[PDB]
Amino acid sequence: HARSTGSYSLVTQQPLGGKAQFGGQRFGEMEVWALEAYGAAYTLQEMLTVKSDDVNGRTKMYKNIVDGNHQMEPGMPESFNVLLKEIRSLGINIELEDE
Amino acid sequence: EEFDAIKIALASPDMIRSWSFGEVKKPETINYRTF
Amino acid sequence: RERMGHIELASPTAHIWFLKSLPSRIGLLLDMPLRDIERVLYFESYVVIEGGMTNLERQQILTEEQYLDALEEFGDEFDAKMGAEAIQALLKSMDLEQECEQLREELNETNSETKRKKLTKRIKLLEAFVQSGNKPEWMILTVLPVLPPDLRPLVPLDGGRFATSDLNDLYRRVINRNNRLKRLLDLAAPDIIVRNEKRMLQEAVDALLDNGRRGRAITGSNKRPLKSLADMIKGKQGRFRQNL
Amino acid sequence: TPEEKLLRAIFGEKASDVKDSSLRVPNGVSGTVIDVQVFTRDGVEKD
Amino acid sequence: MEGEIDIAKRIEDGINQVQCSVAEYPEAITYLLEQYNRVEAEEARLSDLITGFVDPNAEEDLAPTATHVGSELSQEDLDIDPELAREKFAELRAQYVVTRDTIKAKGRSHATAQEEILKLSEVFKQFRLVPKQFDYLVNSMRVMMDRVRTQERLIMKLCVEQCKMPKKNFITLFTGNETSDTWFNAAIAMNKPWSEKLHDVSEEVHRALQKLQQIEEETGLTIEQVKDINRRMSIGEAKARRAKKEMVEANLRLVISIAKKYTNRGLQFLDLIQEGNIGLMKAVDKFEYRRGYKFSTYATWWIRQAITRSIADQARTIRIPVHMIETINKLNRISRQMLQEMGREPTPEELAERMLMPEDKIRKVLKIAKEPISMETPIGDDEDSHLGDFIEDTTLELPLDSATTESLRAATHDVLAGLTAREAKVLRMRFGIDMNTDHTLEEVGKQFDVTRERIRQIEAKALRKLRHPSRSEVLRSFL
Q1: Phi, psi (deg, nearest 5) at residue C62
Q2: Which of chain C's residues have a Cβ under 8 Å away from the Cβ of A85?
Q3: Which of C163, C224, C181, C210 is nearest to C10 (CA)?
Q4: Do E391 and A16 make contact, defined as CB atoms within 8 angstroms?
Q5: So what does this one do (chain A)?
Q6: B29 to chain E: which residues are within 8 Å by CB?
Q7: Nearest 5 degrees, angle CA C54-CA C60-CA C66?
């Protein structure tokens, strides 16, 4: 079995696996700490955003390796920008801020 | 781009009134006919 | 998925993320301890003092048997009040400036066990409300935001049927909890049943925000632990550790 | 639809009313057929 | 069991104190005759105005009609021979004539006008006004004067609290006529140390006086006597209200008793006894101890009626028609009817002749009758997998076709330029650069050439030219 492209949910926005299409290997947390030990960086944030959660950063990347270019930096995760509203309905206000 | 620091503070009815546009009173959801 | 709404609640209701989260924030600053007074008044008829006639206590309760006897003679006016109705009026009628110095001088006069034991969480919390641009009367939610329909979709599955979230049920209920205590009990019912009603409102509000804390909510048909808000958010149905 | 006739007008204009929506073979490996059964509304007690 | 009949006599006793009070009320009388005119030309009926009459001409003698005059509930919870009727209604206009004029212009004293109405008041008590009317007359009586209370309350605290005026110096002036400025002007002329303070509020008092007269004229009664009518209505409704508080408290056991027939259906149990308690408070008001029927049977009638109305529509999470749920059990009490006799399943052929449904459309009806199903329900993984987490989205294009749809709506206007200027510029320079297409008499002056004929030809000729853009596409995407 091998998967490269497939369908995605709405609120969840994650790689699935239908019938005709295969399924993607879920990068378990057990393989996250083993990577942090090396002291990496970009190869850790990718297995959290574009390669799963991030949606608008997944489509833009697909149009970068087709012409022989390079994909830019991912954006803000979808499971994070919705949490801001999820917590907002709990009588508590949350607001982002730069420097 | 990227994220820096995060600010957290209590929520006031004056602020929640801003985002909101009105109030819901009818428990009824949608219709099965014209959807 | 953005923007929200609200619901004008005729009866004030303290939040749950600031009540069970010791130290208290809706009672501690109001002289109320933590549980030996701010939990029993929510249940059956337990009239508590919120104002005061001429130099009285702010923790002593009042038995219904001694209520009808303290109306005519032997008693004064006595600002009587039910449960949730007596918690928001205090926040607005208190001065953090003066009250702060009242408990600051009570750290050596009396022993550190009868009062100081609790007063240790008085100067700390209040100091935060002063340093920051906040205010005590923000813990009481007169309205309640609504979760975006995108997190609670309603799209037909297959066969002309549909598909809705059980969370929606927690909205069609709260409506019948408020409109009932407007033109039926608050001007007709004696008192031995109007109290019970007010007890159901507070229990029906703190259940939506976070279910599992106190009085777990159960849907109509097919029981099963009814889902709420906070439960689905952080995922408390798995004791956290086994997160997603 | 009008806008549809534009596409097929490039690759041979021949849009029929009915098409061939037969059950295609799933991914993997195919195989021969054993038996074939047809029950065009039999007079028996079928549900 | 009893202990509810002896106190039931206190109910109708209070109503009698309301019947008389409402009688002396011009607004309540005018509406009576004015409504009678809708009967002559045939628009309404005397059914919603009068139900019966009485023989004695004193203070009632039989179970009155006024039921919603001392009810504990809110206004929102309070919802014979025609030949003989028209005969009595003709007796009112045989005296209301003089009253119809003493209201329009009247004079200085309103005691003269009400004096004539007093005679009619005795006749109004004879009529059995529909209980629905009392929900308007009495209601619009406490509200109409409600403004009068506040309108005169402001000027009361703008001189006593503001200008500092003794209570003995305001109850001897304003209590007089409280109509014209004969009480205000008399205060200043009293050469008091406080009389020279009303000049800083005379403007506010004047406005609160002129508008005050408007209500007095609208009613047609004296501001002093109008209070007498209502003050005695709060006495009769109080003696009956508290008397009914003992029947709606000791009978809470009967509410839960019949509350086992409408349990798990669509509404919770906490909101179940809601319509049960409100029903008991309604029956106790319209109850008659002088009737053969008891209370433990007559009261449980309205109770099961209020609980069968709420769960009759707003049961499911989504709205549901009435007959859609009554059509299911309809075909049920017949399915076993043919099974207990013949022993075979009723085929959709014999029931198609007894029902109004064919056989095909009746099958699609069952598809509607469902729950249907939630979303946050475990499937297989029972960890992160949810029912609403396997449905693909169509409004949000996936990365696969994200690059395709982009190259199919931004490349045609490049090769479009390489085409006959005339026909190409017509369509392009119309909606592509401007707004709105097809103007006819306006497009003919846009190119300055032909008439309104090629408005359709040029477009058609251009359409077949849109077949050129193969690798490039723009139009083939809207549909």
Answers
A1: -155, 115
A2: 1-2, 4, 147-148, 151
A3: C181
A4: no
A5: DNA-dependent RNA polymerase (RNAP) catalyzes the transcription of DNA into RNA using the four ribonucleoside triphosphates as substrates.
A6: 317-319
A7: 85
Rounded to a whole number of angstroms, the distance from the CA of E170 to the nearest CA of chain B is 44
Instruction: Tell me if chain B has a CB within 8 Å of the CB of E175.
Output: no
Check CB contact under 8 Å for B16 and C143.
yes
For chain C, report the end-to-end CA distance as a whole number of angstroms. Answer: 22
Structure tokens at E152: 């005169």
Nearest-angstrom CA–CA distance, D14 and D22: 20
**E475 and chain D: CB distance < 8 Å anywhere?**
yes
Pair C204, C196: CB distance under 8 Å: no
How many other C-beta atoms can be found within 10 angstroms of the C-beta atom of residue E398?
17
CA D22 and chain centroid, separation: 2
- Tokens 């002063």 belong to C130
Is the pair C, B in contact (3+ CB pairs within 8 Å)?
yes
HSE-up (13 A, CA, CB side) for residue E394: 1
Q: What angle do CA C104, C106, C107 make, to 5 degrees?
A: 90
CA distance C60 to chain B (A): 31
Nearest to B4 among A76, A95, A97 (CB): A97
Beta bridge partners of A95: B7
Which two tokens mark E231? Answer: 């003050």
| Residue length of chain A | 99
- CA dist C69 and C80 (Å) reads 13
Domain boundaries, chain A: 14-99
CB contact under 8 A, A76 and B5: no
Query: What's the resolution in A?
Result: 19.8
Spell out the alpha helix ranges (H) of B1-35.
Answer: 13-19
E466/D1 Cβ within 8 A: no
Which residue type occupies C136? P
Judged by CB atoms closer than 8 Å, whether chains meet at D4 and E479 is answered as yes
**Bond preceding residue C23 cis, omega within 30 of 0:** yes
Establish whether chain B is in contact with chain D, requiring a minimum of 3 CB pairs below 8 angstroms: no
Query: What is the H or E stretch that residue A94 is in?
Result: strand A92-96
With a CB cutoff of 8 Å and minimum separation 6, the contacts of E100 are: none
- Residue E200, classified by CB atoms within 10 Å of its CB into exposed (0-12), middle (13-18) or buried (19+), is exposed
How do strand C61-62 and strand C47-48 relate by DSSP bridges? antiparallel
In degrees rounded to 5, what are phi and psi of residue C61? -85, -165
Instruction: Measure the CA–CA gap between E196 and E192, rounded to whole angstroms.
Output: 7
Q: Is E246 helix (H, G, I), strand (E, B) or coil?
A: coil
Q: How far apart are CA C82 and CA C61, in angstroms?
A: 11
The burial of A56, by beta-carbon neighbours within 10 Å (0-12 exposed, 13-18 middle, 19 or more buried), is given as middle
User: Residue E389 is nearest to which of A12, A55, A61, comparing CB atoms?
Assistant: A12
Region class of E178: left (phi > 0), else alpha (psi between -120 and 50), else beta: left
Q: Residue D20 in 3-state DSSP?
A: coil
Tokens of E177: 């006529």
The total of other beta-carbon atoms located within 10 Å of residue E202's CB is: 15
**Strand (E) positions, C8-141?**
47-48, 61-62
Omega prior to D2 cis, within 30 of 0: no
Determine, for residues E368 and B27 on separate chains, whether the beta-carbon distance falls below 8 Å.
no
Q: Experimentally, how was this structure solved? A: cryo-EM
With residue A96 as reference, give the H or E element that holds it: strand A92-96
- Nearest CB among A11, A16, A58 relative to E390 is that of A16
Residues 6+ apart with CB under 8 A from A22: A1, A2, A3, A6
DSSP E213-238: HHHHHHHTS-TTTHHHHHHTHHHHHH
Measure the CA–CA gap between E78 and E68, rounded to whole angstroms: 7
E459: helix, strand or coil: helix
State which residue of chain A sits closest to B16, comparing Cα positions.
A93
| Cross-chain residue pair C3–B29, CB shorter than 8 Å | no
